[PDB]
A paper describes a structure:
The structure of rBTI is composed of 69 amino acid residues. Its main structural elements comprise a single α-helix (α1, residues 18 to 28), a central parallel β-sheet consisting of two strands (β1, residues 30 to 38; β2, residues 51 to 56), a binding loop (residues 39 to 50) and two irregular structures at the N-terminus (residues 3 to 15) and C-terminus (residues 61 to 69). The Cys4-Cys49 disulfide bond stabilizes the binding loop by connecting it with the N-terminus. The binding loop of rBTI is a convex loop sandwiched between β1 and β2. As in other canonical inhibitors, the binding loop of rBTI forms a hydrogen-bonding network with the protein core. In free rBTI, a water molecule forms hydrogen bonds with Trp53 at the P8′ position, Arg51 at the P6′ position, the α carbonyl oxygen of Pro44 at the P2 position and the α carbonyl oxygen of Asp46 at the P1′ position. This water molecule mediates the interactions between the binding loop and the protein core, stabilizing the structure of the binding loop. However, in the case of rBTI, there is a Pro at the P2 position instead of Thr. Therefore, no hydrogen bond can be formed between the P2 and P8′ residues or between the P2 and P6′ residues, resulting in an extended binding loop distant from the protein core. After superposing LUTI over rBTI, we observed that the binding loop of rBTI was approximately 3.5 Å more distant from the protein core than that of LUTI.
Author numbering: 3 to 69
Write the structure that this text describes.
């Protein structure tokens, strides 16, 4: 079971770099990783990782979550 804030629906539509910094400030246990929308990721579960999926303009398009 993870601790701290688990999802950031409010960051959809923000620049990926800005989102990553907010995420890491708001939950000190996680690393945000900015990747293109649709990028293949490992199918494991972690409490210290937040995928930040962005469109071709570098803007967050999926809700970042701890996973």
């Amino acid at each position: 079971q993870c601790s701290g804030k688990q999802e950031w629906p409010e960051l959809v539509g923000e620049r990926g770099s800005k989102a990553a910094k907010i995420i890491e400030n708001e939950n000190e246990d996680v690393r945000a990783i900015v990747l293109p929308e649709g990028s293949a990721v490992p199918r494991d579960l972690r409490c210290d990782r937040v995928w930040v999926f962005v469109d071709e303009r570098g803007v967050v398009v999926d809700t970042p979550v701890v996973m």
